[PDB]
Design a protein around this ligand. Structure first.
Ligand SMILES: [Ca+2]
Ligand SMILES: [Ca+2]
Ligand SMILES: [Cl-]
Ligand SMILES: [Cl-]
Ligand SMILES: [Mg+2]
Ligand SMILES: [Mg+2]
Lengths: 8, 231, 231, 8
């Protein structure tokens, strides 16, 4: 998958 | 601009209403108008700006990735897939250019406190990163280096001025790590940054209240998720 | 309009791409351009038109309901909540007026087959219903009666020309039932219509293929869901 | 809740 960047 | 006749406070109030209604294009237009009033933004107001544009560009990026995949499968028909991918791409670039323009005129130059300056430089890195995701021309390396330079300045400030658990410091390190992995083709740097950030945050948790602990550990979990994905 | 220079086939192709990318405003603009080419729409093309505008107005309606609720709680502060609810309301009305304009110029008058004519008259009822959800002025009763008249003509055709399991007949009856319950303050009529529609569809299922059975029973379940909610 | 109108 694509990695997590900052998210609420 | 189009929001010039509305009071700053009314723009902020309507940005919050637009968030509740999940009307993120409206939210971004209201917050763009608030920035263009020329006054600095509060903590809360910076968050509203970030949330609005993150949701707008986030939908554009997701659409661009769908269309780019269709386009790649098609090149393994007519011009329509390329045309429509280009349309979405140009609209995404326009949104990124608008955000970068707000940062440059004049949010960053007036941001003196660590919290605001790191926040805006992280934003600058993020939106150059989104430009980098779609870039292919003569200036693609310069776009990548613009993202890197903004992230790097934000990192230098955050390491000097903020504790390792500070949420904006953690979120900056998370996104710079993603930049290393996905944009700069530097997975080892991405992994090293995420691990060092996680470990130094872990060692500072003992200083925090219950509420600050919750805020910091939430972002640490995103670092952990990427490390598990990458290793 | 803005799509006048694009080929009809390219507009249809891009509408399908926009659906895959969840870009429903683009999808609606492409399908509006396809309609304005002046040729009749195929089954598939009518569905693309419906899907596009249903998603666009669906987001507007959801936002309007959020804002209307905030506004009601506020009247139990300044003008901002009312202003922004009005902004969303006006944009929703504009989308409904655009759809009704396409139906009137000239989709309905050229629709001779039961399947197309019932589809477009159901659409006309739906979009007058969405106008009715936000209506408060001198013409509100006329808006309601415009929805009713369109649904009623579609019902009369569908009962004469289509089997009781036909998905467009079922979906029309479902939405006319919702009109009765939510708009016309006629819950008994809503319940009676949903029950009679369900029962007559049930008795016709034996005539269907496995695939048609799946299509019809899916919509019958929505009728059942409303009956369970209403009784 | 609000009732179901036709949806895909
Ligand atoms: Ca290694
Ligand atoms: Ca009764
Ligand atoms: Cl296009
Ligand atoms: Cl407004
Ligand atoms: Mg003022
Ligand atoms: Mg032609």
């Amino acid at each position: 998958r694509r990695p997590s960047s900052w998210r609420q | 601009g189009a929001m010039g006749s509305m009071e700053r406070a009314s723009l902020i109030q309507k940005a919050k209403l637009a968030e509740q209604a999940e009307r993120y294009e409206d939210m971004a237009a209201f917050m763009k108008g608030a920035v263009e009033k020329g006054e600095e933004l509060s903590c809360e107001e910076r968050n509203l700006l970030s949330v609005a544009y993150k949701n707008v560009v986030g939908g554009q990026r997701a659409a661009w990735r769908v269309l780019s995949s269709i386009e790649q499968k098609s090149n393994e028909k007519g011009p329509e897939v390329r045309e429509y991918r280009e349309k979405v791409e140009t609209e995404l670039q326009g949104v990124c250019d608008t955000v970068l323009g707000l940062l440059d005129s004049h949010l960053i130059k007036e941001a003196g406190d660590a919290e605001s300056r790191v926040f805006y430089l992280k934003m600058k890195g993020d939106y150059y990163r989104y430009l980098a995701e779609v870039a292919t021309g003569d200036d693609k390396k310069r776009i990548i280096d613009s993202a890197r330079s903004a992230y790097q300045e934000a990192m230098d400030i955050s390491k000097k001025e903020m504790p390792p658990t500070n949420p904006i410091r953690l979120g900056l390190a998370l996104n710079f790590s993603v930049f290393h992995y996905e944009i700069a083709n530097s997975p080892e740097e991405a992994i090293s940054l995420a691990k060092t950030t996680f470990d130094e945050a872990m060692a500072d948790l003992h200083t925090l209240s219950e509420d600050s602990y919750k805020d910091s550990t939430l972002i640490m979990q995103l670092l952990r998720d990427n490390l598990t994905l990458w290793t």
